C-alpha cells in the first residue's frame, strides 16, 4: 500500500518533525494509530515478521516457475516488417539495366551528406552514374533517399547483419551496392509488392 508511517520517512527533517509534533495525524495519506489490541497485533505483524517482503518473494518465485521470453540467436530471429530500413542497395530492371539515372535527388535530400555522385553520358547516349558512394559510417538510416528516388533505384534492404572488422569495408562504392541488390533482389521485390499499396 501507499500509506505512510512516522518513522519510514527517508529524510531527517520529516523524521524530526514526526517525533516532536502530531501534524502527521491531519494528513490523510498516513496510517492511523491502532486503537485496540488486535490492531496493535496487526501493526506488529506488519513491522516485525515482514510479510511485505514475502509478497514480492512469492511473485518472484512464481516468475521462477513461469515461461521465458529469450530467443536463441542466431538459430532463432526476431520479428521485422517490410518497411524495415537496413543496408542500402542499388537495383536493376528485369532486363539487367540499372534503374538509376543520376538525377541526384537522393544526394540532395540526404541530411548526413552520406552520398557522393558523379555522372556523364554512356557510350549509347544513356544517362548513368560513374561514381555512386555511400559512407555507411556517415549514414543515419532515415530512408529519405528511398523516398526521394523516382525510379526505385536506391532502397534500404532487409539486411541488418553487416558488421565488419575494418572501417574501409563500410565505405560502399557503386559496384558493391549493385552486388547487394543482385543478392537481395527477390526479397526486395516481395517487400515492395506490399509496400506499394501504401507509398
Amino acid at each position: 500500500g501507499t500509506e505512510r508511517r512516522p518513522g519510514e520517512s527517508g529524510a531527517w527533517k520529516q523524521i524530526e518533525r514526526q517525533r516532536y509534533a502530531s501534524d502527521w495525524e491531519n494528513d490523510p495519506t498516513f496510517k492511523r494509530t491502532p486503537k485496540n489490541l488486535a490492531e496493535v497485533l496487526d501493526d506488529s505483524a506488519s513491522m516485525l515478521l515482514l510479510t511485505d517482503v514475502w509478497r514480492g518473494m512469492a511473485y518472484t518465485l512464481g516468475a521462477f516457475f513461469d515461461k521465458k521470453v529469450t530467443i536463441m540467436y542466431p538459430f532463432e530471429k526476431g520479428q521485422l516488417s517490410p518497411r524495415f530500413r537496413g543496408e542500402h542497395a542499388l537495383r536493376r530492371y528485369p532486363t539487367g539495366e540499372e534503374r538509376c539515372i543520376a538525377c541526384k535527388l537522393c544526394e540532395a535530400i540526404c541530411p548526413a551528406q552520406a552520398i557522393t555522385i558523379e555522372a556523364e553520358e554512356r557510350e549509347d547516349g544513356s544517362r548513368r552514374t560513374t561514381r555512386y558512394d555511400i559512407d555507411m559510417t556517415k549514414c543515419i538510416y532515415c530512408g529519405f533517399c528511398q523516398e526521394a528516388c523516382p525510379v526505385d533505384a536506391i532502397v534500404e534492404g532487409p539486411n541488418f547483419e553487416f558488421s565488419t572488422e575494418t572501417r574501409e569495408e563500410l565505405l560502399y562504392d557503386k559496384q558493391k551496392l549493385l552486388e547487394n541488390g543482385d543478392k537481395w533482389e527477390t526479397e526486395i521485390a516481395t517487400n515492395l509488392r506490399t509496400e506499394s499499396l501504401y507509398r
Binding site: 543496408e87 556517415k138 549514414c139 543515419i140 538510416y141 558488421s163 572488422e165 563500410l170
Partner: protein, 157 residues
C-alpha cells in the same frame, strides 16, 4: 617436436575458448545507442547467455563498447579509461556516431569516429543498430578471438 607443437596448438584452442566465452565489456552509454545496448542485455536477447557480464571498473574489463557519439570534451576521458584496461583488450564501435561522426560529422564539437582516439576491432553499423545486429557484431568479435594463436607464436619466437 610434433607432439609439443600439437600441445601448444591445443593450449591456444583452450585459451581462445576461455577468452571468447568470458568477455566482460565496459559500458560507455554516451547516447542513443546505449538504449539498444540495454535492450541487448535484457531478457529477449540475453547477453549474459553468451558469458557477457558488464563491469563497472576498467581493471576487470575485457572489452570496450563505444555506444554513442564522442565529443571533444569527452575524448580524453575515454582515452584515459581505455588506457586503464589491462591486456588483452578489444574495442567495439557501435553506431554511426562512434563509427565516423554520423549525423554530427560536420560539427565543431564532435570527434569524427572513435578510430581517431582509440583503435577498434569490430564496427557495428546502424543509427541505432538493432540489439540483434549488436549480437552479430559480438559473435564476429568472438570469431576474431578464435583465430588468435598466442602460444604458437610464442613457441616459434
Amino acid at each position: 617436436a610434433k607432439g609439443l607443437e600439437f600441445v601448444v596448438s591445443k593450449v591456444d584452442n583452450v585459451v581462445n575458448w576461455a577468452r571468447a566465452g568470458s568477455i566482460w565489456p565496459m559500458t560507455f552509454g554516451l547516447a542513443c545507442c546505449a538504449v539498444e545496448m540495454m535492450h541487448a542485455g535484457a531478457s529477449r536477447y540475453d547477453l549474459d547467455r553468451y558469458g557477457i557480464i558488464f563491469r563497472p571498473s576498467p581493471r576487470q574489463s575485457d572489452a570496450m563498447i563505444v555506444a554513442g557519439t564522442l565529443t571533444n570534451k569527452m575524448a580524453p576521458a575515454l582515452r584515459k579509461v581505455y588506457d586503464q584496461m589491462p591486456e588483452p583488450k578489444w574495442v567495439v564501435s557501435m553506431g554511426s556516431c562512434a563509427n565516423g561522426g554520423g549525423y554530427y560529422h560536420y560539427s565543431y564539437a564532435v570527434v569524427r569516429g572513435c578510430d581517431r582516439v582509440v583503435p577498434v576491432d569490430v564496427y557495428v553499423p546502424g543509427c541505432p543498430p538493432t540489439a540483434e545486429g549488436l549480437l552479430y557484431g559480438l559473435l564476429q568479435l568472438q570469431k576474431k578471438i578464435y583465430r588468435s594463436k598466442t602460444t604458437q607464436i610464442w613457441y616459434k619466437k
